[PDB]
Coordinates of C-alpha atoms in Angstrom, one line a residue:
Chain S
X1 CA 5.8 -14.9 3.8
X2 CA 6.7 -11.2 4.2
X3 CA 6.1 -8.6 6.4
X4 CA 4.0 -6.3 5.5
X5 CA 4.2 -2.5 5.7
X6 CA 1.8 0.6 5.8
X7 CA 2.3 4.6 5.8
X8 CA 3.0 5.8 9.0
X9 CA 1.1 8.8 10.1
X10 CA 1.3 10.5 6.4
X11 CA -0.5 13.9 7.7
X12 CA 2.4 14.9 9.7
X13 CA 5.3 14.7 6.7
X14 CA 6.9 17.6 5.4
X15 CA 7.7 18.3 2.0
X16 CA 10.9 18.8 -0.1
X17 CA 11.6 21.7 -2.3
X18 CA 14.0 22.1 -5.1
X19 CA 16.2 25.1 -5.4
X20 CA 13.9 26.8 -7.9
X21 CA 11.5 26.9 -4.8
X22 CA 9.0 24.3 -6.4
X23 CA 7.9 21.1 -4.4
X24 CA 9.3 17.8 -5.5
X25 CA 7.7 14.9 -6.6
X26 CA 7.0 12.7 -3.4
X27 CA 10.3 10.3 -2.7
X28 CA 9.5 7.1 -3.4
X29 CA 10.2 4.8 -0.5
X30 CA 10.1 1.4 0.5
X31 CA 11.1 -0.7 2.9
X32 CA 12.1 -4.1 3.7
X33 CA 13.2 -6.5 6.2
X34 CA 14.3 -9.2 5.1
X35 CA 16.1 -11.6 7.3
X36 CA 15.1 -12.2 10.8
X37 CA 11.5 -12.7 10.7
X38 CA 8.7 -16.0 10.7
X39 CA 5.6 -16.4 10.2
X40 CA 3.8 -18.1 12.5
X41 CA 0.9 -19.6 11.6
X42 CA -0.8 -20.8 14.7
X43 CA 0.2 -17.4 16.6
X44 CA -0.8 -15.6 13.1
X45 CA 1.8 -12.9 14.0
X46 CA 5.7 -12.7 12.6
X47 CA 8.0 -13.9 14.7
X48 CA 12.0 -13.3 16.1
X49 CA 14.4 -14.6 18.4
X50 CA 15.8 -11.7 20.9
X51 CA 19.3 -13.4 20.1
X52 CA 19.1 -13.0 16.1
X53 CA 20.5 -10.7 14.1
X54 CA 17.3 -8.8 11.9
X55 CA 17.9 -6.5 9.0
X56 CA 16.2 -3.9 7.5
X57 CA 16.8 -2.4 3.8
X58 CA 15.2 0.8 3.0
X59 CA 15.0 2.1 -0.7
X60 CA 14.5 6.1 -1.1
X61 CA 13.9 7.4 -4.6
X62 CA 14.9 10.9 -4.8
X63 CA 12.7 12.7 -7.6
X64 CA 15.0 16.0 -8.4
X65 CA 17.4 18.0 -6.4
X66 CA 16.3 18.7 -2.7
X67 CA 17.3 22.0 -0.9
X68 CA 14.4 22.9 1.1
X69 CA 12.2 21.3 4.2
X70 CA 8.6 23.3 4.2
X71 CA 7.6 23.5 7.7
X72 CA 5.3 25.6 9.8
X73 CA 7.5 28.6 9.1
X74 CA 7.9 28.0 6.3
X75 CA 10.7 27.1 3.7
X76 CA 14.3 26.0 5.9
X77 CA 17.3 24.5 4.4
X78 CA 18.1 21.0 4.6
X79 CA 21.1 20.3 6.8
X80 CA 21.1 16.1 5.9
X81 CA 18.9 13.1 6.4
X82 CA 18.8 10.8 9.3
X83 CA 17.0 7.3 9.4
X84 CA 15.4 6.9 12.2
X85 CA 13.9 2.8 13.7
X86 CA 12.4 1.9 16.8
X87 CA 9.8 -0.2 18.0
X88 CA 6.6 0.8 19.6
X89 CA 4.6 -1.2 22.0
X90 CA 0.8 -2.6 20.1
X91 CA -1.0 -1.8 23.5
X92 CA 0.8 1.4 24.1
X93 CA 1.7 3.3 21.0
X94 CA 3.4 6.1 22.8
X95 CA 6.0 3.8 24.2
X96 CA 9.3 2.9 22.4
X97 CA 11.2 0.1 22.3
X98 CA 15.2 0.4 21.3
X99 CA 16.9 -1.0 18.7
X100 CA 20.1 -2.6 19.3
X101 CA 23.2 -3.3 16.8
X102 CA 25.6 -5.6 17.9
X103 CA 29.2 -4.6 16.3
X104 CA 31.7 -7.1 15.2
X105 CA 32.7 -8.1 18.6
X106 CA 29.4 -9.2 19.7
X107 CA 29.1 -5.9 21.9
X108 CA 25.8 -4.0 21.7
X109 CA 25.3 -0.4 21.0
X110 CA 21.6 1.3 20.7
X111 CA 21.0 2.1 17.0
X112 CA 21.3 5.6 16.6
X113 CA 19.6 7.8 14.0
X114 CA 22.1 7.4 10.9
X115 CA 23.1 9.8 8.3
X116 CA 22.1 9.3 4.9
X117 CA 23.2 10.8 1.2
X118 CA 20.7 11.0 -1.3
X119 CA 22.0 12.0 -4.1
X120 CA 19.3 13.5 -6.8
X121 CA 17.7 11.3 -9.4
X122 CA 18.3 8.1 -7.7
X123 CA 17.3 5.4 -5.8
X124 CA 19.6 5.0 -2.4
X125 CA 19.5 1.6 -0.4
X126 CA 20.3 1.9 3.2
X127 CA 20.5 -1.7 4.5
X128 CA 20.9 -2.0 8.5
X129 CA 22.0 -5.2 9.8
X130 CA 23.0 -7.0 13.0
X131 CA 20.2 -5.3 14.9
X132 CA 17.9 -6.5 18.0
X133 CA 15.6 -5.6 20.4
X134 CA 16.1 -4.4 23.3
X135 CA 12.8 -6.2 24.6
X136 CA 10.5 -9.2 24.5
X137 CA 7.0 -9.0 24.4
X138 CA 5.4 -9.8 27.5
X139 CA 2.6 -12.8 27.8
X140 CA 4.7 -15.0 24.7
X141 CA 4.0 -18.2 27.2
X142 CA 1.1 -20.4 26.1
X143 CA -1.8 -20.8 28.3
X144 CA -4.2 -23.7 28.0
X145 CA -2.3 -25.1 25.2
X146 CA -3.7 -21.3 23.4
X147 CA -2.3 -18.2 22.6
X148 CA -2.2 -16.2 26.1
X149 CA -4.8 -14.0 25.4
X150 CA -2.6 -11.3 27.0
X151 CA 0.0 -11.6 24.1
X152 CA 1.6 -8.5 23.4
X153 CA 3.7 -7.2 19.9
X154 CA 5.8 -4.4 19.0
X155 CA 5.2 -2.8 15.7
X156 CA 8.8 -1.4 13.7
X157 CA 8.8 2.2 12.8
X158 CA 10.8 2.9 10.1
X159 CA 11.3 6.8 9.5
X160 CA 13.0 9.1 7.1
X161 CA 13.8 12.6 8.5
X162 CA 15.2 15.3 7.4
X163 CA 17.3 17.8 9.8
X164 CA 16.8 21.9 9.3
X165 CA 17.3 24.6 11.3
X166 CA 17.5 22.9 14.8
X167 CA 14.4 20.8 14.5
X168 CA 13.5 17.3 12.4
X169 CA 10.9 16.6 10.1
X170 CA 9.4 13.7 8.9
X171 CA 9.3 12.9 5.2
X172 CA 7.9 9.7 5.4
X173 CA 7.9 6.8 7.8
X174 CA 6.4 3.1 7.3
X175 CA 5.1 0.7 10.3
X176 CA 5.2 -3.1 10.3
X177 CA 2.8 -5.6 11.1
X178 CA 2.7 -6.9 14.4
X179 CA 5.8 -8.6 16.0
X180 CA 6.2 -11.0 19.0
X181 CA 10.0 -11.2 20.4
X182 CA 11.2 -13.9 22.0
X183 CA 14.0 -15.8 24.3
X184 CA 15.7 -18.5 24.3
Chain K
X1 CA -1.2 -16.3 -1.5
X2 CA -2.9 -13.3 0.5
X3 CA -5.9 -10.9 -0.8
X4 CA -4.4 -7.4 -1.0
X5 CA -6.5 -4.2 0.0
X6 CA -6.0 -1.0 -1.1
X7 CA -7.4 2.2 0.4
X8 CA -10.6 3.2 -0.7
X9 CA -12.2 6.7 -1.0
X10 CA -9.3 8.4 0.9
X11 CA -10.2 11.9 -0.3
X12 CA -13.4 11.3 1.2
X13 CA -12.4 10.4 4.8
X14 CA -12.9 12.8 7.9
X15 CA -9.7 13.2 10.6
X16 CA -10.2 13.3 14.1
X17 CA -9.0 15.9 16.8
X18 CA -8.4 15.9 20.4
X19 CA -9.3 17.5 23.2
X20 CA -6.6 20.4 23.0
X21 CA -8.0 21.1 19.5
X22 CA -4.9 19.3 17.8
X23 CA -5.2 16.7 15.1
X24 CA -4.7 13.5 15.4
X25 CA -1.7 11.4 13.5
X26 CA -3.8 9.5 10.9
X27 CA -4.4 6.5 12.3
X28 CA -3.3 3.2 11.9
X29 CA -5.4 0.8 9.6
X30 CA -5.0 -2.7 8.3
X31 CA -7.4 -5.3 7.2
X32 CA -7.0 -9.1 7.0
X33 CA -9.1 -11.5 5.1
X34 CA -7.7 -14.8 7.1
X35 CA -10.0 -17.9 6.2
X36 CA -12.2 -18.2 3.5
X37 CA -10.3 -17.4 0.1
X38 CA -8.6 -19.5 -2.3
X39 CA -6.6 -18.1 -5.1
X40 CA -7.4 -19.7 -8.5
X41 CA -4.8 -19.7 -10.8
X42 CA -6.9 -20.6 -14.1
X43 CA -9.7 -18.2 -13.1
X44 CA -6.1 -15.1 -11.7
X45 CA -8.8 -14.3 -9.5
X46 CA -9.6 -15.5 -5.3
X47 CA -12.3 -17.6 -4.9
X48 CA -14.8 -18.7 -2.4
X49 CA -17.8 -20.6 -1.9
X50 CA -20.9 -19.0 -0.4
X51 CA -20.9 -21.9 1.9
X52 CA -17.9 -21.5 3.7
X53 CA -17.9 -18.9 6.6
X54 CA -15.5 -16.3 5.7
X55 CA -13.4 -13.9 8.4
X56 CA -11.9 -10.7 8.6
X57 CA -9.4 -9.1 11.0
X58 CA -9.0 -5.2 11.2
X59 CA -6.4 -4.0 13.5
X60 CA -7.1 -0.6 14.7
X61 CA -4.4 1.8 15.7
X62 CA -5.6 5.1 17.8
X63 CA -2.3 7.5 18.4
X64 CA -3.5 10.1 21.0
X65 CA -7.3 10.7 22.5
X66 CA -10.2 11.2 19.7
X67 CA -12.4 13.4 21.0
X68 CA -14.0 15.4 17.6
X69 CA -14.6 14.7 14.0
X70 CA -13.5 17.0 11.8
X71 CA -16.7 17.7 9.4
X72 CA -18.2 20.3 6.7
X73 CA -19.8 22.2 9.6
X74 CA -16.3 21.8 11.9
X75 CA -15.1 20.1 14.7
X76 CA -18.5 18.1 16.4
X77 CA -18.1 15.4 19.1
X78 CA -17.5 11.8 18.6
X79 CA -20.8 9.8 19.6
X80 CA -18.9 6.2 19.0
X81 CA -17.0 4.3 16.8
X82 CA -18.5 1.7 13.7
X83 CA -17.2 -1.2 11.8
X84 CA -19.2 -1.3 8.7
X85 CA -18.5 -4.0 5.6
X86 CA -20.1 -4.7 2.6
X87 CA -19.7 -6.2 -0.7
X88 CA -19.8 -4.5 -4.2
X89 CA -20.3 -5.2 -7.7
X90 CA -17.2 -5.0 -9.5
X91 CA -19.3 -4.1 -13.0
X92 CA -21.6 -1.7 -10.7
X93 CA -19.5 0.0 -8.3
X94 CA -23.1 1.7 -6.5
X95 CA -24.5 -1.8 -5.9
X96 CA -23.6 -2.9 -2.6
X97 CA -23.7 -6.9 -1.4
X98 CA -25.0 -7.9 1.9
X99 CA -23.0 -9.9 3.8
X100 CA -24.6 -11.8 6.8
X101 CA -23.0 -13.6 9.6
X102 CA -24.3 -17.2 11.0
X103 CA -25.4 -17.5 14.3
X104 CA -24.2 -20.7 16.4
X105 CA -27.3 -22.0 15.7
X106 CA -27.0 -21.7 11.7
X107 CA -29.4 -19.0 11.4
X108 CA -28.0 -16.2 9.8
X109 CA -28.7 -12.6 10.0
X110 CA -27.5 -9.7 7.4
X111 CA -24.2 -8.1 9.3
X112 CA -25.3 -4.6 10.7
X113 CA -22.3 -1.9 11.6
X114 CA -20.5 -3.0 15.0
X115 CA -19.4 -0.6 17.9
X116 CA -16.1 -0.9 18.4
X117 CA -14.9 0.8 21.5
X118 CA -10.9 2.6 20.4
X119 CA -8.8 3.1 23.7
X120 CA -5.8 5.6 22.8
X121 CA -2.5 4.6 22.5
X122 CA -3.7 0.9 21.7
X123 CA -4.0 -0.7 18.6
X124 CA -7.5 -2.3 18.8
X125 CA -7.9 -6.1 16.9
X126 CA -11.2 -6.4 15.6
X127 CA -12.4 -10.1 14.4
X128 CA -15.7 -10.5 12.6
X129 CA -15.8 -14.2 11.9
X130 CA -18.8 -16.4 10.4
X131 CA -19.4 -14.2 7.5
X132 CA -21.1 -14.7 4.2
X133 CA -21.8 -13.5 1.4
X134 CA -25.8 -13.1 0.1
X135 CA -25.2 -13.9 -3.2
X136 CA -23.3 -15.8 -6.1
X137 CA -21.3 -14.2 -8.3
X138 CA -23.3 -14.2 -11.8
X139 CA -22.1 -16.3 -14.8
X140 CA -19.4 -18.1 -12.7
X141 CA -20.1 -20.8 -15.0
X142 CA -17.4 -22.1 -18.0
X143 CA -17.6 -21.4 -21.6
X144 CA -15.9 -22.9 -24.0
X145 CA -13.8 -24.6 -21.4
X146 CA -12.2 -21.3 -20.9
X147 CA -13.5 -18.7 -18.1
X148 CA -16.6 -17.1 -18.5
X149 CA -15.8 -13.5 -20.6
X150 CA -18.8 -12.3 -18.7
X151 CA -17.6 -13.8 -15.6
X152 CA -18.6 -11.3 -12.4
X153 CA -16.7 -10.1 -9.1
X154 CA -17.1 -8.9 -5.9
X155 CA -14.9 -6.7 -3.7
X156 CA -14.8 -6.5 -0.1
X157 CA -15.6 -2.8 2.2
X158 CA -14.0 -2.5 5.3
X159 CA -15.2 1.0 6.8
X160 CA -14.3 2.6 10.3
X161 CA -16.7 5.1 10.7
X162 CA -17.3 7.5 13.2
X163 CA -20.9 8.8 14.5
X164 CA -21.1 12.3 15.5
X165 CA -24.0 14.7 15.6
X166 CA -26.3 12.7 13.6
X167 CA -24.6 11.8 10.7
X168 CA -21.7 9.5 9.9
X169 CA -18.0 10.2 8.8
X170 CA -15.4 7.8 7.1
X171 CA -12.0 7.6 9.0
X172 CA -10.6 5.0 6.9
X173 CA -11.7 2.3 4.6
X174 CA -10.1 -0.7 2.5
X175 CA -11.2 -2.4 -0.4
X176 CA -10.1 -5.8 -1.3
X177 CA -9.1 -7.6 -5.1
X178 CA -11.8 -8.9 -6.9
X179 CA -13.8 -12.3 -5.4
X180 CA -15.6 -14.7 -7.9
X181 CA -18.4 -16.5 -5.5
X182 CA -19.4 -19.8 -6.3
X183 CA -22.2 -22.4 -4.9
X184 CA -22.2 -25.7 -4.7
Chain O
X1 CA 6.4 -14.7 -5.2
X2 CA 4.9 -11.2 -6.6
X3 CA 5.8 -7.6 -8.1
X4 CA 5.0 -5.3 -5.3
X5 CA 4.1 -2.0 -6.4
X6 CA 3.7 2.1 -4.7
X7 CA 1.8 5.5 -5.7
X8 CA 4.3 7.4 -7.8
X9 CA 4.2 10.8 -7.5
X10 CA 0.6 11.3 -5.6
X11 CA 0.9 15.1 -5.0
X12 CA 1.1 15.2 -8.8
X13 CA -2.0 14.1 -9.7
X14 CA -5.2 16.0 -10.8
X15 CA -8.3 15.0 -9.6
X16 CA -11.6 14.5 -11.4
X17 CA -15.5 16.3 -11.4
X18 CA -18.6 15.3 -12.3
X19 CA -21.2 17.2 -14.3
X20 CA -22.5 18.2 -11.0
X21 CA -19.1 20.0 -10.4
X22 CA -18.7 17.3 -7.4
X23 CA -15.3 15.9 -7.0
X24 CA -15.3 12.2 -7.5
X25 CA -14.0 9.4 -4.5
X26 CA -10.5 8.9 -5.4
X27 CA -10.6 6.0 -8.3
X28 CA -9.7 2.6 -7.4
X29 CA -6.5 1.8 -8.7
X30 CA -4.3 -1.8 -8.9
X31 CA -1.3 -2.5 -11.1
X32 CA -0.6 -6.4 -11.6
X33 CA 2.5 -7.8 -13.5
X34 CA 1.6 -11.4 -14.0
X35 CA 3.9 -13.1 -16.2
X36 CA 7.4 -12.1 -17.1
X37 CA 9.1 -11.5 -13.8
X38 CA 10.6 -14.2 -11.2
X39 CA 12.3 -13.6 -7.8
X40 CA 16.3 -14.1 -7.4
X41 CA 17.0 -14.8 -3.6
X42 CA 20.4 -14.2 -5.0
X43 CA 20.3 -11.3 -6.4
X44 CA 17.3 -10.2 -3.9
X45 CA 15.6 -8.5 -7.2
X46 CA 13.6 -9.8 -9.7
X47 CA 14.5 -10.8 -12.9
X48 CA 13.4 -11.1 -16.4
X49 CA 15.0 -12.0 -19.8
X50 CA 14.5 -9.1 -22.4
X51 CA 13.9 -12.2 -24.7
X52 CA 10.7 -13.3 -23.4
X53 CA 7.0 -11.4 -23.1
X54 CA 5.9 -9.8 -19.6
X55 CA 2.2 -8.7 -19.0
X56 CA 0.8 -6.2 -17.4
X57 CA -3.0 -5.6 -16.2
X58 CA -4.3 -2.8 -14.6
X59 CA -7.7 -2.4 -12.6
X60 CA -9.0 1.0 -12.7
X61 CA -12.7 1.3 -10.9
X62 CA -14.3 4.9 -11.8
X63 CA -16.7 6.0 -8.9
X64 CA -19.4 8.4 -10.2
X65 CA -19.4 10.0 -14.2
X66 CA -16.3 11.8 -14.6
X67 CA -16.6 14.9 -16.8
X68 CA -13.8 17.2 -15.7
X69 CA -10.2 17.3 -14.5
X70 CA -9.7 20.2 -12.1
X71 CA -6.2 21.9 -13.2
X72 CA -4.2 24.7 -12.7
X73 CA -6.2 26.3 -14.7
X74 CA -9.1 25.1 -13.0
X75 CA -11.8 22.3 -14.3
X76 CA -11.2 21.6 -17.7
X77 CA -13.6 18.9 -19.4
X78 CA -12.3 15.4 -20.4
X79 CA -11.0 14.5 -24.2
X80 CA -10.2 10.9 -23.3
X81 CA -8.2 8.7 -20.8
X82 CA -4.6 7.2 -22.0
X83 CA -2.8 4.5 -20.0
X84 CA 1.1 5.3 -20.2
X85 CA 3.7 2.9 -19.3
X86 CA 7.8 2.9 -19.1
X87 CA 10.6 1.8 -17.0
X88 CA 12.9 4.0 -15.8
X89 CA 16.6 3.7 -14.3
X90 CA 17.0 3.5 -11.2
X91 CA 20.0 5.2 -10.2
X92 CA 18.8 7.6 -12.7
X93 CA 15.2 8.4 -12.0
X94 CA 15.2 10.9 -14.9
X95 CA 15.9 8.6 -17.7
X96 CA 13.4 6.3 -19.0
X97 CA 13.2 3.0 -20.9
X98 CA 11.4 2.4 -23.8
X99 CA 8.8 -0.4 -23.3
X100 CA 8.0 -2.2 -26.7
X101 CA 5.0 -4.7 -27.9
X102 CA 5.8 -7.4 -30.5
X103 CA 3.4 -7.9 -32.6
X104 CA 1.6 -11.0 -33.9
X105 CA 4.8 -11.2 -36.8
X106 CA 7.2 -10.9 -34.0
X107 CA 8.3 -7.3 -35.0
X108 CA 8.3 -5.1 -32.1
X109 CA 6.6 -1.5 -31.9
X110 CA 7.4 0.9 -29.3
X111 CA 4.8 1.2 -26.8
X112 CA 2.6 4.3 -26.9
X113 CA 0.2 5.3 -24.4
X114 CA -3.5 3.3 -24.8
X115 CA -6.6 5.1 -25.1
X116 CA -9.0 3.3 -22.2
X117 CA -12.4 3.8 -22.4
X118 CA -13.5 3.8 -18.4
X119 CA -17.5 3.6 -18.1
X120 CA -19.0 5.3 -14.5
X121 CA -19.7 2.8 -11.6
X122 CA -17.3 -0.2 -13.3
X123 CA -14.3 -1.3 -12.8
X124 CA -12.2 -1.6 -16.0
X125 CA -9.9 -4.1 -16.5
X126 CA -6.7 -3.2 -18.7
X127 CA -4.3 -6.0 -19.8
X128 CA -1.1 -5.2 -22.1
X129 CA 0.6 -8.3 -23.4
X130 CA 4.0 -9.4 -25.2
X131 CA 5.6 -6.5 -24.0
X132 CA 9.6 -5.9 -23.5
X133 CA 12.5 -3.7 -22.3
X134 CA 14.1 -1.8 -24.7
X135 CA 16.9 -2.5 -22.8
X136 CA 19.1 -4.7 -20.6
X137 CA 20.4 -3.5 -17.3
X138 CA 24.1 -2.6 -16.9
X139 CA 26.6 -5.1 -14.7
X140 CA 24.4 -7.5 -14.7
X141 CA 27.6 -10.0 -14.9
X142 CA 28.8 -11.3 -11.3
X143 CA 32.2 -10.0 -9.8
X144 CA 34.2 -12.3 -7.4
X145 CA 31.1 -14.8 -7.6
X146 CA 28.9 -12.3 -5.7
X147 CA 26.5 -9.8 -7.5
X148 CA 28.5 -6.8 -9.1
X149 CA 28.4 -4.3 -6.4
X150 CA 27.3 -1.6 -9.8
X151 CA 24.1 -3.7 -10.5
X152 CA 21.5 -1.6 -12.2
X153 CA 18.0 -1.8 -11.7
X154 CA 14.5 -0.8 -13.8
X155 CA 11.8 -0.3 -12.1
X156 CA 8.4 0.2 -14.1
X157 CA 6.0 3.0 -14.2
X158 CA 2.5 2.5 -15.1
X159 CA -0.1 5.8 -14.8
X160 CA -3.5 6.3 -15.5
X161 CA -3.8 9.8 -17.1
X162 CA -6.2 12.6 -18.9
X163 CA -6.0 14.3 -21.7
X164 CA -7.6 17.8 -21.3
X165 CA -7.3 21.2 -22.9
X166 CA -4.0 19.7 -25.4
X167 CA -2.3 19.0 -22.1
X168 CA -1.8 15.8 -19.5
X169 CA -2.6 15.2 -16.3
X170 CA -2.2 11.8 -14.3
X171 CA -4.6 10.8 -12.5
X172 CA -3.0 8.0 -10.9
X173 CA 0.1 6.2 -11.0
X174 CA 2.6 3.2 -9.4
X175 CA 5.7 2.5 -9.5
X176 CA 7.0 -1.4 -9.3
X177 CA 10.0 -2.8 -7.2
X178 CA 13.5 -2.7 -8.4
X179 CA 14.0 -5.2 -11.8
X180 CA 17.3 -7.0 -13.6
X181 CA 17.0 -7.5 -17.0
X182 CA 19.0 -9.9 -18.6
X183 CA 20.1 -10.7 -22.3
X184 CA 20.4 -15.0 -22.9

């Protein structure tokens, strides 16, 4: 079974325009994470260990030749894309939870936003491994042989943003399905 | 195998604003038909029997304070919040299905909309559970030892709603893949 | 496991009036390839031979009487509805593939769009058998035992659109998950 994904507050995105000044088709854009998640059928929630590595493969579609963010003031031009992911907490959606990677010597560094190329006319994959979080959910231990009714899950925000004139804008973003972290 | 939801109506659904004025990010919506369908391959439809209690999960996520509806005449206060779900007719899309819900004493009554209270910042599960549908699926029966060609469906509504001023607005709504229901 | 499939292009498409110059709820819309296309944990992609048929079956569910497509020009009325579908390359989002039907004498016709009659308040179901790719993907053969690091990709396109006033205008469309296809 797979994690499942929805659209991400879609009201706040801004658009792309081409260097003829007209809007582009909406990118396509999907997203996937593939290893480090379970299904669990009796908690009915995904799954992860804290100590595995989880990955995360994004595809962006680029349909035509992007020059322009439109934002409140209107048309800026695009300085470069950053991917953006972080958890958030299920019971308090204003509260983030950091992503770690862990580099080849088993070290940890908190996963940064990450520069991206997208090239016009194609489809990019951005795949992040060897990444973590930062957190458990509180309330994983069982009570009464039951789910603690107190469980709590973190939710993975995956975001595509694009950086002009000294602020970001979203251009679309995606938001798992609930999540419960835990140790070993 | 899973039944998959798509949304439904989206150009008809209201948005909701706080108390500075300020939209809201579009909230969070996903439904989840647990127990109660089977997926037949030989009829490439899900199946159920009107028997069998049915459930369905809706996990509700509110990012910031609702305070208004936005609406025709403008922004009016939010009275409360309603789960509403009902059946339709695949070959008569206006006809709706009651679905009714059996008490723990095997009565049943028709399932009325549900007040569902939305903190902010949370995402709020919602589990209806013991649900039925009123009625059989016409011409569920085999001909020719091949499906039915006049075989019948029903699809699933899952509405949030909002009350305000009198009158009631759509904030998001899902409708499910086509359910043949069979008796016994 | 299954084809999963995304809108393509949403702030493309027109939308549709009634002859009460009411804009219709947003059609139902579900795109289902059912045979044709397996899943390579190898090759994380799925496959298909060009050799062998693949099927396609759309569910398009029309809300109300639709009598005009609301266009640049304004609300023109409808001529007819035409179901278009093509792959296109994925590293090259401009370029399509040819999608072709063999016949019942196993000659193959290219694919033209499908006039589909789409009665108010029903949902229509579309099915398009024995179809095939034009084409094969490039570097489909493996390098160093591991995939070829220039793998291309199709992914298919299936749209819903209206002819009005001798132009086009989709009315919905989705666009499938990344796909090999190989020769035998």
């Amino acid at each position: 079974e797979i994690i499942k994904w929805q659209p991400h507050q879609q009201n706040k995105w801004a658009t792309l325009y081409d260097a003829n000044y007209k809007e582009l088709p909406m990118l396509t854009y999907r997203v996937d994470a593939d290893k480090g998640f379970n299904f669990s059928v009796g908690d009915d929630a995904f799954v992860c260990q804290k100590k595995n590595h989880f990955q995360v493969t994004v595809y962006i579609g680029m349909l035509g030749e992007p020059k322009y963010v439109k934002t409140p003031e209107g048309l800026k031009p695009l300085d470069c894309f950053y991917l953006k992911l972080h958890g958030v907490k299920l019971e308090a959606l204003n509260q983030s939870i950091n992503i770690e990677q862990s580099q080849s010597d088993r070290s940890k560094r908190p996963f940064n936003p990450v520069t991206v190329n997208l090239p016009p006319e194609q489809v990019t994959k951005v795949t992040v491994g060897r990444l973590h979080f930062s957190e458990t959910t509180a309330n994983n231990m069982r009570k009464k042989g039951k789910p603690n009714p107190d469980q709590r899950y973190f939710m993975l925000v995956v975001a595509l943003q694009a950086h002009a004139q000294n602020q970001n804008y979203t251009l679309a973003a995606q938001i798992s399905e609930r999540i419960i972290v835990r140790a070993s």
